Amino acid sequence: SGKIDKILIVGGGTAGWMAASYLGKALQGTADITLLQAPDIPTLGVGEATIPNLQTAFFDFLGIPEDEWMRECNASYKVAIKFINWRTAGEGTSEARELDGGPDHFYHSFGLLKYHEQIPLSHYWFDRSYRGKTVEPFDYACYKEPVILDANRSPRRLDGSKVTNYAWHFDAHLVADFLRRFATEKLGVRHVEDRVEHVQRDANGNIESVRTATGRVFDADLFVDCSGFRGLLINKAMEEPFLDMSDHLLNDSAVATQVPHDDDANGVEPFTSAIAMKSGWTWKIPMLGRFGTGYVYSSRFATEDEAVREFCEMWHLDPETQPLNRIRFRVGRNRRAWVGNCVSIGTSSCFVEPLESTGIYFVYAALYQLVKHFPDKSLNPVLTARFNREIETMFDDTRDFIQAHFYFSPRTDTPFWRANKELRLADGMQEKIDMYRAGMAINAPASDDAQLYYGNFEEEFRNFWNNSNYYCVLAGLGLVPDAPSPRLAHMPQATESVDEVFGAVKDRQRNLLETLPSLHEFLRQQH
Amino acid sequence: SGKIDKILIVGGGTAGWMAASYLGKALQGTADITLLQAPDIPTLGVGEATIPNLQTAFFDFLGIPEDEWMRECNASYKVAIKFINWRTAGEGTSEARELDGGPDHFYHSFGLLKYHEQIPLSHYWFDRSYRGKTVEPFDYACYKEPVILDANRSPRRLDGSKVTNYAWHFDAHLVADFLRRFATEKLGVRHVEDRVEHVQRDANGNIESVRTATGRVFDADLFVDCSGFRGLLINKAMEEPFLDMSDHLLNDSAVATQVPHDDDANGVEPFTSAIAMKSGWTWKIPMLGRFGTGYVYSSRFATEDEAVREFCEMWHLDPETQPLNRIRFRVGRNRRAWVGNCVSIGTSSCFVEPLESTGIYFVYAALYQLVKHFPDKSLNPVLTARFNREIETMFDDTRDFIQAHFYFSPRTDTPFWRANKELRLADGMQEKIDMYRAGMAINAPASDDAQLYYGNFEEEFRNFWNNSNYYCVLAGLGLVPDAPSPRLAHMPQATESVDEVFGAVKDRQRNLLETLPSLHEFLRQQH
Ligand SMILES: Cc1cc2nc3c(=O)[nH]c(=O)nc-3n(C[C@H](O)[C@H](O)[C@H](O)COP(=O)(O)OP(=O)(O)OC[C@H]3O[C@@H](n4cnc5c(N)ncnc54)[C@H](O)[C@@H]3O)c2cc1C
Ligand SMILES: Nc1ncnc2c1ncn2[C@@H]1O[C@H](CO)[C@@H](O)[C@H]1O
Ligand SMILES: N[C@@H](Cc1c[nH]c2ccccc12)C(=O)O
Ligand SMILES: N[C@@H](Cc1c[nH]c2ccccc12)C(=O)O
Numbered sequence A, B: 001s002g003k004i005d006k007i008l009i010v011g012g013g014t015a016g017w018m019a020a021s022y023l024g025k026a027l028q029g030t031a032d033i034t035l036l037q038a039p040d041i042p043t044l045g046v047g048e049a050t051i052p053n054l055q056t057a058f059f060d061f062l063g064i065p066e067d068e069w070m071r072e073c074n075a076s077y078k079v080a081i082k083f084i085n086w087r088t089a090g091e092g093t094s095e096a097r098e099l100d101g102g103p104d105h106f107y108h109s110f111g112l113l114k115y116h117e118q119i120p121l122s123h124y125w126f127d128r129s130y131r132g133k134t135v136e137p138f139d140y141a142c143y144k145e146p147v148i149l150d151a152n153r154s155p156r157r158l159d160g161s162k163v164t165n166y167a168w169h170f171d172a173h174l175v176a177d178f179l180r181r182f183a184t185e186k187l188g189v190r191h192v193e194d195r196v197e198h199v200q201r202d203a204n205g206n207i208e209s210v211r212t213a214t215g216r217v218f219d220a221d222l223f224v225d226c227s228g229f230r231g232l233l234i235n236k237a238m239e240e241p242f243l244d245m246s247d248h249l250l251n252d253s254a255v256a257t258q259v260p261h262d263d264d265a266n267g268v269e270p271f272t273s274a275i276a277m278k279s280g281w282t283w284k285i286p287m288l289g290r291f292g293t294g295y296v297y298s299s300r301f302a303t304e305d306e307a308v309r310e311f312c313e314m315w316h317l318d319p320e321t322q323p324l325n326r327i328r329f330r331v332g333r334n335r336r337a338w339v340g341n342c343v344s345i346g347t348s349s350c351f352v353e354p355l356e357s358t359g360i361y362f363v364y365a366a367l368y369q370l371v372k373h374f375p376d377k378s379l380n381p382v383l384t385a386r387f388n389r390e391i392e393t394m395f396d397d398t399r400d401f402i403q404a405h406f407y408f409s410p411r412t413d414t415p416f417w418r419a420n421k422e423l424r425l426a427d428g429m430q431e432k433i434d435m436y437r438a439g440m441a442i443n444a445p446a447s448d449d450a451q452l453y454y455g456n457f458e459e460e461f462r463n464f465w466n467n468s469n470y471y472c473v474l475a476g477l478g479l480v481p482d483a484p485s486p487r488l489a490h491m492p493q494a495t496e497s498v499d500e501v502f503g504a505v506k507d508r509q510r511n512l513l514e515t516l517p518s519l520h521e522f523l524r525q526q527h
């Protein structure tokens, strides 16, 4: 035995520099860490969207205040994903089509639905809706956010005070750079810029060393594969199978760019947009004076050329002239994330389309779990197996949630939208849908206190997709229960007094619409 | 087909009047509830021990102040279970044998272990123990309670202020009677004294009505089976299989009585005792001026006559003339707790020996789950299946935990203690043990805040047997990890600073021991 003394991280980029920073912090002064990465053709900054626990689980762990990193990474704010045109037929367009007297949009906001008499607000909304007491959409009824986001309001007042839960939009290249500087200058991580040419394994099949193009040899007790979709160590050297999951997710490709934006004329949207297309969907990630955008599509339904044309047409770009990243993804996860002394982190481990902003989350969630299940040199098999279980659940739950965005869309207008209805939901997901249709909450949060949830990683990891999230997406798409929760007919006092809860939301919608600065005004001050 | 209009509860006792009270409260004014019970030969009050969520999940739900019910039921206080003679060979005796320089006892107390730098105190204790920095037992190192329980201290100061988490000892008959008065007088529950003679089912297999010995016919939409081990409705009428769990639990019998106690001469113990015997264990449940006591034993290893002698000799009672309850238990659970329109609640549903004070908890836990999954007359099968899943798990996790008390005892002195080592642990339990031996937390609480835990039934129910409970019992019996958590060697600042955490336990131990009144002194004032 003996403790792990030496760690080698293969791969720079976002996953590698997060691994370096997180492990550098968690093990400070008790492990020697080297990061090895090949300088290679850089890509356009197409923007990344994130979730609130980035600050609480990751940057707060490193001891880095939000102000410091967000200014270094020219970050903007995200209060929701705005799902546009998921219910209406037609071409890929940036503009919401008309549906039932209003624009075809719904929001998936941060935070938790309020409990009223032990029951989530969603259930009272649906009861009122089903019985014809309201025609208001779920999101406008139950959340203060949709009204303020429509007006492009800031989540913070000019004095700094926070009025809602929020996360960040940034170019991931800037965060990687920031973290490289942090790990190397403050945590003692050694940075080697060289290309892996050969991986030597021992008779147990564990990694012994890595040899580079220059002939340099690096050994370690633990190897962290951050090599991206290649899986240099986990797939290639350790021969661990990748599990494709295109039986749940048709999308496997993207064409992506960055588009200049006049924030003075137009303001800045405090949300990511997920814009439904003919054969996939397009993201819009507003940053400072630019937005990142990418058409995520299914290569089985659109050629690369059709996707390039569709995408450029929507943003009025010239396909001959616009800088484009064309990407084919690996969709799914390794059979096992950690094998022997090789732990995969980032896209070497797993990947799903960025429909719910989970990419960066999967990196620091895995790093949290790695540290929790941290081995010594005997590599206790129970630690590895438990870590692998946490990763497979983290990923599979997300794969299911995302499939549900396509599966329950009402659209039948293209081969793509119809083909989605013909895939099967995983058993676990079918069960959640059955519960939802019976009027049950799905993974209701133990408390409705958002600070408990976003302030405690263990609490959020156990309840990652919660009832609020399922209702936003399912009810947004138009999937609703077969009938109201049977409980509510036995609670006349509760269904009466819930009216004040809805009034309270209406009050916050009105007062925040009147008092909040624009996101653009706040960003100018903040940066 | 419409809301449930009528509910018939079959069976009184504790489970039936809890069901009546809880449903009467939950559905007040929107369902007609009748409880049907035949008068039966009454038993000696042999005592019941409970857990803190009795007040917060049951009596607080009903609107009943702790002071009110406890004075009506002549209740005492419980701070822990004290396990006596589980590690040493010999006869069934009320006196602890010597082990390693002190008495053979350990405590399973209420509360949660403190987290230090994200890691439960248990892990720091074991690190120190393993490296020979301490020989102090786990319970004495990590809990303030053992010291004050050794001195029979009150959990409340004379001014009423609470210094620890605690629950109750009482004669269950007094609680059943208190609840009968409450439900009939405050909640409009109809009480009918009659004996079920016939259960009429329809062609869907649902119960239509029950006919009594007087010829009265009681119909309802939902039938609650609180008939006890007989399972009048769920087993006899609905023919639901009962799963015997004697491959995990050998104890199936008890002989029990009540002993007068002079509390002025001797004081009152603020704990349940669980006293290891040759072929089982004996409870001691202090009440006011008396204790309830019962030898739980395996009919495979002792005859009724033998258990009677061992039990009576322990307490110096005449086996020929002492009033005794001779009980054969039905150990295990139904394949399904709820079938068609018939829900089992209490021992008609499931039973395990009272080794961890779960019997009353299983009643209001299931009642909370019933209201959560409450049907209308269409009896949506998803509600029933999900309720059944929550009940299976609540029971099977308790079965597993209880089995571990016998399986990990070091005793080999009687056929009984040896035979327990020849049984298998369930897969899910073996997995927990594997994790524990690897130095992992088992079901670490999301938070170490006991108020959030005991004040939020969802939080507690999802994490019912937590890391604290596993360490009290496993480490108490002497099962410890193979090696310290490998994480800790990378945390030299945390393993240094945890000394203040152990020192604070020691300060609370000393200060509470010096300032607390006896349990008996507080009870005189309280009652
Ligand atoms: C289309 C797209 C959109 C996304 N959108 C979002 C989003 O909105 N929100 C979000 O949170 N996440 C998003 N993500 C996920 C996120 O971008 C990634 O997890 C992360 O930012 C980058 O992945 P990575 O670091 O694992 O891999 P990579 O960036 O591919 O890094 C690979 C590294 O490995 C090194 N390497 C490989 N082979 C060798 C070798 N032979 N020798 C030496 N070095 C080697 C490379 O040099 C490089 O340093 C998105 C991802 C994609 C693909
Ligand atoms: N045949 C029956 N009719 C009515 N109540 C019953 C019957 N059998 C058992 N019970 C009730 O179940 C409880 C036993 O724990 C008692 O209230 C008892 O009256
Ligand atoms: N637990 C996550 C769920 C989530 C992931 N991506 C999201 C995007 C929008 C809203 C919620 C989410 C959160 O509330 O942060
Ligand atoms: N979650 C329960 C666990 C428990 C059941 N029986 C116990 C007896 C003693 C201590 C804890 C328990 C509690 O803390 O109440």
Ligand SMILES: [Cl-]
Residues within 6 Å of the ligand: A352, A353, A354, A355, A356, A357, A358, A359, A360
């Ligand atoms: Cl993503």
